[PDB]
Structures are given as C-alpha cells and as structure tokens.
Symmetry: D2
Subunit: 141 residues, 4 copies
C-alpha cells in the first residue's frame, strides 16, 4: 500500500464528486499548481478546491477523470488520467460550445510532509480544442 498513491486518488476523486470538504487532509498548506497562475493567486487547499470548482463549472457537473495508471518514485507520483467533459462554461475568452470532449492528461505530484505540495498537469489542449470545434476567442479578457 502506497499512502502517496492513495492521496493522489483522493485528489482524483474530488474532481469526480466535486466534494472538497476534506482537502486539507491531503493538500499541503503551501500547495501550488503553476498552471492556474493566470487565473488566481491562491495557494494550498484553497487553490486545489477552487480549481475543482472551475472544472465542475466549465466542464459540467458530469465532468469525470478516469484513471489509466498511477506510479510513484520516492516523493513523486505520476498520474495518467482521462478527462471527460462538456464545454458549458466560458474558457480563456471562448464562449461555451456545448460540445462533449475527452482528453488524456498527465499529472506530476510532489509530496512534502506527507501531503501534495506541488502539482503540474498537462491536458491534451490541442485534442480538446479540436473536439470543441476550434472556437475563436471572443476576447483576451
């Protein structure tokens, strides 16, 4: 049994259920995901929770993250996942298309003090953009 992989699976489950009441259990106070720096200055459990909320709002309550595979090496965990969603919310200046999409993701997680301390994630931006009909942005904001 890996506590690290268990913790990462709790993180995946949060995106699925949208339930983040217990996020402080597994998200470090100093948690950072550099991928959302454009959108927020938050850190820690608050940052992770708001990103979950963003996924649920932009990609619908039916948005799911399926596990392909998870592995670990020392204090790091790598997760191979697949996002399923429907584009119901505005995203980087693009109006909702209402279109279904699915895309692989890779997530890289560093543990510090038994908690997720750094989180990088790579969506399949181009593949998702294609499935969304390659919308033109209506603004840069």
């Amino acid at each position: 049994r890996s506590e690290q992989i268990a913790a990462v699976r709790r993180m995946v489950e949060a995106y699925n259920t949208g339930k983040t009441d217990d996020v402080a259990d597994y998200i470090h106070p100093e948690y950072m995901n550099p991928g959302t720096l454009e959108f927020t200055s938050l850190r820690g459990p608050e940052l992770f929770a708001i990103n979950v909320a963003w996924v649920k709002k932009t990609f619908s309550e039916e948005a799911r993250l399926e596990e392909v595979g998870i592995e670990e090496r020392a204090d790091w965990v790598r997760a191979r996942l697949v996002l399923y969603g429907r584009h119901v919310g505005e995203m980087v200046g693009m109006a909702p298309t209402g279109r279904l999409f699915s895309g692989e993701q890779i997530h890289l997680l560093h543990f510090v003090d038994g908690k997720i301390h750094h989180h990088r994630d790579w969506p399949d931006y181009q593949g998702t953009y294609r499935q969304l009909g390659e919308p033109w942005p209506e603004t840069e904001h």
Copy 2:
C-alpha cells in the same frame, strides 16, 4: 443541404444504434474499407454490416461515434468523429481489458453512383492503446 453528408450521418448512426437493415441504401455494392482487409474478404453493404456488428460486440453495445464536424468537396466527404467505448471483446489477439476509452477519428469517404464506395478511417490507435493500459497480445492469430 447535402445528400452525401446525410448519407455519412446515416453511416455514423448505424454504428451507434447497431441497426443495419437499410445499409444497402447508402453503402455501394463495391464498398471497400481497406482497414479491415486483415479480418475479412467481404465487400459492399455486407462488409459494412459485419463491421458495425464487430464494433458493437467488441467495444460494447454502448459504443458511440460522436460528430465533431463533417465537410465535403465534390464526390468526397471528410468526417471528424470521436469513438467512445469499453474494450470487452478480443481484438488483434489481445484479450479484453475491460477499459473505457475515447479517441478521435478521421474518415474519408468517396461517393460513386450516389453511394459510399470507398471508406478510409484513421482511429487514434496509439491514444486508444494508452487508455487500454497498453496490453500485450496473447497471440498473433484468433486466438
């Protein structure tokens, strides 16, 4: 309106419903899809109905092709679709993985005599293979 695009949409719906009673309406008697040459020597509506049945049996009755976009140029149609399924039957000598998957597909269809005459399709093999957990074949035959 385009009759060709309409015919390609009927083709897509046949994969989705598994209903193939009427395939002779839009599939040419000389219909060929070179992608299944390995598995069968069939042609025409017969080939198409078998391939539909293969999809339903292998990727489950819930297997679905969603339309992203379809364009046409003269007697040719190009469809951008996404396949969704669960791997529940043997395929190319790999045992069922039970794995959900989804992958974009490009289809190229040539119309002749008002019917789909040639059909090339490109699954996202590698993308799907990853989602299946990259299974090793148990055999190069049937099994």
Copy 3:
C-alpha cells in the same frame, strides 16, 4: 497581403534564428504570454525575447518552428506550427534528457495597435513528454 500574418511569421522566424533585436516592431509594449507566468514577471518585447532565448537554450540552437498553416479572423491570428528540438537544458525541474522531439503547437495571437498584444500557445506536452522518455523531476524548485 495580411500585415498581421506577416508579423506572426516574423515572430516564428525569431524562434528559428534566435534574433530578437527588432522585436519591438511587432511585439506590443504590453505583450503578455500567460504560459510563462511561472518563470518570469516580464512583459512586452522583453518577455518575448527572453522566451525565444529560453527555447534556443533549452531545446538547442537547432530548435525550429515550422509553419503548417496560419489563419486570421479580425484582430486575431491562429497559427498551426510544429516545434522540433532536442532537450538539452533544465526544464520544470527535470534534468536534460538529451532527447529529440517534435510536437504540433497551436498559437492564438491578439493584435492591438498593429502589434502582438496577447499570445497563448499550446505545445503538445504529453506527446513531447513521451518522446523525452517520460523523465521524473529531480526537484520542484
């Protein structure tokens, strides 16, 4: 003859030659690429120039960006490009892998005052990472 497309082509050639002396001609003073917020607080011609220099340093002097196609819609340009390189510098806490790679990219450019004002780009992260041999990070930094 689109001046916007010509400007985006000069931008592409900059990554190719590594020459940034003239970037003020086509990069807006308030130019932003949100993709590099993790790495730098720079803006304008200076931000664009350091990012080109980053590419040449990390993906080698031989790194090339190839044009597949470029379209425009009003004050916006969308470029379909392909990056070729070899991973020779540190990148997000990963040691250099020395690996060749190539990945499609989508770039979205907003023009203001006849210069590039906003720039978003989507590398094929997962495809590239596979070609890199999927390295584990040595640090989060």
Copy 4:
C-alpha cells in the same frame, strides 16, 4: 536480447534503405497486415518493398528514431518516431512536399528466431494535420 537486436536492425533498414540482408531477421512467412491494401507479398520481399516505399514516399532522408523498446516472451514492442517529407503519392493524395513527424508503436511477434508478425500504428491524424490535410484526387 537477440529479439531487441533484431528489431533494431529492422529499424535501421528503414533509415538506410538497405534491404540486402533482411532474410537474416525477417521470417519467410513475415506478414504486416497494414499493407494488404497495396501488395500480396510476404516474407523478406514484403519487408523490403515496404522500406522502399517509405524511402520513395517520405524521402531518402526519412528516419525512425527510437523512444523505447521492450519485450515479453516472444513479443517485442517498439515505441518510435517517424520523421519524413511528403514527396510521393500516398493513398490517392498528391505530394505536398511538407515535413512531418509522428510517433509510432510497432508490435513484433518472433517465430523460429525471426520476425513473423508485424503490426504498426502510425500517428495518422497528426501526420495528416502536418501535411495540410490534403483531399484525395482518386481512390483508385
């Protein structure tokens, strides 16, 4: 591993275009079902015409780079990347002259110490995108 060594020679053959010695590692009953549309050949002769077709269509400078290779019993799985330039006719599409690069997965079955079954999955969609998504001029 002699199997991995044999698969590396196979990869080298695409790179050099040199097919003189393919009978060394290609089984007399060698099949690649991906080319059934284009030829009825089998064995070393099939493998050799497929390498020639690659050199002809994707240029003499076309090459396969290795990402990783692994094996399980009598099977080898090779993760590769094709680099090429589209200079020859291909499934009814005229040469675009365009550069492209795409990952491939190859699955090889060994029988009697030689490559007997060969399946390969190009990144068709990604390559097609890099080629400008040309429309075919003919089905044949």
